[PDB]
Design a protein around this ligand. Structure first.
Ligand SMILES: CCCCCCSC[C@H](NC(=O)CC[C@H]([NH3+])C(=O)O)C(=O)NCC(=O)O
Ligand SMILES: CCCCCCSC[C@H](NC(=O)CC[C@H]([NH3+])C(=O)O)C(=O)NCC(=O)O
Lengths: 217, 217
């Protein structure tokens, strides 16, 4: 079994847990829990961070024999390479590179927001530029089944997480309907994914750590 | 001729310009200029922004015929693949992926400090954490000539830049005296790199936008 370590929260590990589940990778999880509210008690993780033999300790991490990685994108590319779920053609690789990076810029934007004490003050500007961000992704996907072509890749798990989060935030966003929605329905109908979602291991929320103003429940 | 677009400063395009120079790729630059102070109106960019045919409009961007890219790392990979500058084995790909991602974490924590209006009060904590981050990077490299191995990859162009930045913000750092310094010293002695750093187009500053509280022009 491979070991995935991350906080007992959705966050940056969602796409990794889904990929691990789809590619049928035997795994276990180390889900670090919190302690005394409301004082930030990372101790469960902190008591273990500098004793795992990781080169750049962080969350999430994945241990697979002597392979010890940190950096979520790196863990994905690692899992994906064992099942050829990275690009194959040059153009597919460019589409993968550009989106993995772009999806992180949108993930951080959102993260920044739900974390700021000025959330309600920032919410309107954010929603002002959401639609356009979504139109871009819709235009990029076009009529393809997946973000790169007919081949499903790790960037599709990334895209699903990021889009499902935005769907969480604003459930009836016009730009969310259309090819973006069908994409979501396309992802959730994948056999091992459907099965994972109806299992008792799947955690749809909370998206963020307990200190977040939006969705920490 | 590929066209690299970005503001007329060093910023996030440093690693790319060095990779292009070293690879001997013929290129051209579309430097975007900011209006006079304190306005710094960036209309030179927004004017062209949605007229380039880029999927996700942003700076830097790279246009090579029908190839049009916008995320720095993806642009670096695009070039790197053409010259076998990514990893060639599983272990090398892992070092490439983890590093490419950790160095982005490093760069951003630094852009945040230097762009925050609280710089001077944040500066102490940043310095107090630095020696650990440098030591980590030093343990990783070990007695290797390059970060990935005995062959130069694009991640060395990143490490050189993230590190060069730190050398400039705290030259007197002990952590930076060791193999890390031999690495920079080695990077700078490469035929096309040195040939470059002495040219008239080479620019070591400013690292940040004119609005930053540290190093600008
Ligand atoms: C609750 C999730 C909210 C999402 C944003 C914060 S992620 C949490 C944070 N991890 C990181 O910053 C890692 C980022 C890194 N770029 C990666 O991709 O792995 C952590 O707790 N690291 C542990 C540590 O640094 O000790
Ligand atoms: C060492 C870092 C120095 C920082 C200098 C400015 S970074 C560029 C700035 N912000 C970006 O996010 C662009 C970079 C993009 N995120 C990438 O990863 O390639 C921009 O002009 N983006 C274009 C836009 O938003 O219009």
């Amino acid at each position: 079994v491979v070991t995935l370590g991350y906080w007992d929260i959705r966050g940056l590990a969602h796409a990794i847990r889904l990929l691990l589940e789809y590619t049928e990778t035997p795994y276990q999880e180390r889900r670090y829990k919190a302690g005394p509210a409301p004082d930030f008690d990372p101790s469960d993780w902190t008591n273990e961070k500098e004793k795992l033999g990781l080169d750049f300790p962080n969350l999430p991490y994945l241990i697979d024999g002597d392979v010890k990685l940190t950096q979520s994108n790196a863990i994905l590319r690692y899992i994906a390479r064992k099942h050829n779920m990275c690009g194959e053609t040059e153009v597919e690789k460019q589409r993968v590179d550009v989106l993995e990076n772009h999806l992180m810029d949108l993930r951080m934007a959102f993260a920044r927001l739900c974390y700021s004490p000025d959330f309600e003050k920032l919410k309107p500007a954010y929603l002002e530029q959401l639609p356009g961000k979504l139109r871009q992704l819709s235009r990029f996907l076009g009529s393809r089944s997946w973000f790169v072509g007919d081949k499903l890749t790790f960037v599709d798990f990334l895209a699903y997480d990021v889009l499902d989060q935005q769907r969480m935030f604003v459930p009836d966003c016009p730009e969310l309907q259309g090819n973006l929605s069908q994409f979501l329905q396309r992802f959730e109908a994948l056999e091992k994914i459907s099965a994972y979602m109806r299992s008792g291991r799947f955690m749809k929320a909370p998206i963020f750590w307990y200190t977040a103003l939006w969705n920490n429940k």
